[PDB]
């Protein structure tokens, strides 16, 4: 969620406050400099497990192409619900089907 300045609208760069021994975010096209609340500068992760449950849409209960299961929806306890598998294209994608209800659309597993 890298963010800009509120008036300069240019990207903010983490600059160290060596005089005061702190971290702050700096902009190049302006003099608007603000203190940084987080020492974090970069977060590069190797095991990608972000957004796997982000393939959720509200109208998922409207499409007829989906099948209807007999399972009990934990939130709505309805015997009319659909279910789909992970949308990520990773070769190591799992076969854990995120059963999706119709009133809660919540990703759950019976495992």
């Amino acid at each position: 969620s890298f963010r800009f300045c509120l008036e300069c609208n240019n990207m903010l760069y983490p600059k160290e406050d060596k005089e005061n021994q702190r971290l702050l975010y700096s902009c190049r096209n302006c003099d608007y400099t603000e203190l940084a609340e987080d020492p974090k500068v970069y977060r590069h992760e190797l095991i990608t497990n972000i957004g796997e449950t982000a393939g959720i849409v509200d109208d998922i209960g409207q499409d007829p192409t989906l099948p209807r299961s007999d399972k009990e929806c934990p939130e709505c306890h309805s015997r009319d619900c659909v279910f789909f598998q992970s949308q990520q294209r990773r070769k190591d994608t799992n076969m854990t089907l995120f059963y999706v209800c119709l009133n809660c659309k919540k990703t759950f597993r019976d495992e």
Binding site: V57, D63, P64, T65, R68, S69, D70, D80, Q87
Partner: protein
Amino acid sequence: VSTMRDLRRSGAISPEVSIIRDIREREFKIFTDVGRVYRPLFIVEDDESKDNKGELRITKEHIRKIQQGYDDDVYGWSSLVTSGVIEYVDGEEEETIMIAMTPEDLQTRSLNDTAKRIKPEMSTSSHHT
């Protein structure tokens, strides 16, 4: 999408106009290009607001009229297309529909013959739309 499909089936929109909704991607595309390919199909009543759900929009009366050739207050194929029982579907729109192979599939069955075919199990969907 409901109203647009209704309007096309009424004939107010050119029948060969394709109405495509991709729910997963939060998109909705319409195509009226030239050169696409399409084929006709029956229109199965779907709305869960009338007894006709899960039944063919066509009826014996339509067949009788076709055989006559004139409506009993010409009646050709185009009449069937516009009357709202058969709609053309292009290749792309096929992506988002459930097509029964034969009318008998619209009605769930209960035999055991060795000289004929056996349908696919098709038990992975407790219900079908």
